[PDB]
Structure formats: structure tokens, C-alpha cells
């Protein structure tokens, strides 16, 4: 019997800092929980690819997702949500993408990332409880931008690094 | 100037242990370093890529390295090894693989991995300094074998899950 598997560690991240993970393959990007009602488990899909169903581990568990991004030239970020702890998966939101470059950010008792398609990714927020202790785990090496340079993380996002 | 790259969280990994890691896209599977004379980053290689250089971030600096995978259907595995703290990678090893598993363990004064052509993958061992404390960073979920089931590793490593 094979235990597990086993996920790298989730951070602590602090509140008021974008997270910006820069991905270079398809696969989980980052996962984000507030540990009461929202876990999110964030895919990404590469250009061209036609209805298929993909295994992924989310939160540790192998889930079957039937994925699509028709585009020739934009990645397609995908927002898995689960609302309890054994609940299923669906699709909450999506990110097409020419810089392969996603954000995700603790503020204000919400959980923020990116949505729509750049260069005109705006953002999405999700009310968390106990924001500040929300967990994220990164599969991507990522950068850290503070709040207060949101401007320029809007920039990296739509235009890239 | 971006505070980064910053990157997923090393992993404990006791000794006698494979860390089996199941990646499911191109880049960063795993590094490990000795922290004396090896630093080692393992990058996949999806099937079909004629030469071209691929920038990946390794050990939390941005390396570009010239990749390619001749093979339709055998994703590969390319061991990137520096042997100084300031040094240049070179390929040291390489895995093709239809199971798209990846392998490493300390033991025994020595990190193990394994080499060579699915389904008849062998293991390699390195020489590193103060082996159980070598730190391992994996960039997706694993299970973890014991080096007494070496033999169910081997079969996984080979013949998927």
C-alpha cells in the first residue's frame, strides 16, 4: 500500500504580500487554504489543449478533472475549490495567461488572486475566516511584492517579467 | 528589484528512505545538495522538444540550459549538477521514462537516484559529504518506500503506479 502521497510544506505567507509564482510547467500551482471553508487547489493548463481528463493531487487527494484551453498561445490557469474538508472539487474561476505568472495574497480577511486574461487580469477576492493564518503552498518558486507595490505586481502579471 | 525567487519548502527526508516524486509537467522535479560540493536540480523534459534553451530557476537563481527530448512518448529526466556554491551546471545523468517517477534517497554516505531507460531503470549513487543531513526540495507531491521495499520502488519507478 502506497501512504499518502506527501505535499512539499505550505507558508504562513504574511498578510499584505503577493505571492507571484512563476511556474514553467502544466500542474498544481499553488494551493491556498483557510483551513475552515476554502481550499483552493490552482491547475495550470497548457496552449492547445483539447477536452481531456487529468489526474492531479489537490490537497493531497488524486482527483480526476476533465480540463480544456483551446487557445493556441495563452496558459489557463484553473481555480479549484472545495468548500469542506472531504467535499469534491469544482472550477471557481480561471486565468488566461501570455506570462505564465500568478498571484495570490492575504488582506483584509479575504484571499486574493488574479482572474480573466491578460494584459487585463484583474483581481478576485474570496472572504477566508481567520485570514491572517490562511496557508499557502507553493509548488512554483515564486517572488513576494508588497501591497503597496500592487501596481507593479499588476505589471508582471499582464505584461511579465 | 523582486524579492525572489524564493522556493517550494525542502522536505525533511529520513535516511533510507526513496522520496518517489510524481511530477506531471516540464521543469524543476527536485534538488538536492549536499551544501559542500554537490548541488543537484533534476528538470523533465516533456516528449517531442527539438533543441532549445529553457530558463529554470535552480537552487534560487535563474539558469538558462540548453534542453531537448528526441523521444515521442519517453519524458526525461536530466540531473543539472554543480560541484561549487558559484558553479556552472553540466548534465551529469540522464532517466527516460513512460511513468513520469523520479527517485531519491540518502543513504549510506551517498544520495541515490535513479538512471537509464524505463522499464529497466537502475539506481545511482553519489558521494556526498554529511549524507543524512543533505537537503532534499521536492516541486511536487511523492510517496515515500523504505529502502527494505527497494524492490516495490523499483517496480513503480519502472512501471508506474
Redesign the interface.
Known amino acids: 500500500v ?10 504562513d505567507l504574511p498578510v499584505g504580500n503577493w505571492m ?1 509564482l ?7 500551482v499553488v494551493e491556498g487554504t483557510d483551513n475552515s471553508g476554502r481550499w483552493l487547489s490552482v491547475i ?1 493548463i ?1 496552449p492547445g489543449v483539447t477536452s481531456e481528463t ?4 489537490m490537497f ?1 487527494s488524486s482527483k480526476q478533472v476533465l480540463v480544456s484551453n483551446a487557445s493556441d498561445t495563452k496558459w489557463k490557469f484553473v481555480e479549484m475549490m472545495k468548500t469542506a474538508i472531504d467535499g469534491d472539487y469544482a472550477e471557481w474561476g480561471t486565468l488566461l495567461s501570455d506570462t505564465k505568472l500568478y498571484g495570490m495574497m492575504k488582506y483584509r480577511k479575504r484571499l486574493f488572486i488574479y482572474e480573466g486574461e491578460t494584459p487585463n487580469a484583474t483581481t478576485k477576492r474570496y472572504i477566508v475566516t481567520n485570514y491572517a493564518s490562511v496557508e499557502v503552498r ?8 508588497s501591497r503597496s507595490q500592487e501596481s507593479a505586481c499588476t505589471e508582471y502579471i499582464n505584461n511579465g ?1
Open positions: 502506497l501512504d499518502g502521497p506527501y505535499q512539499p510544506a505550505s507558508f507571484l512563476a511556474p514553467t510547467g502544466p500542474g498544481v495550470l497548457e487529468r489526474t492531479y493531487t493531497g507553493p509548488y512554483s518558486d515564486f517572488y513576494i511584492i517579467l
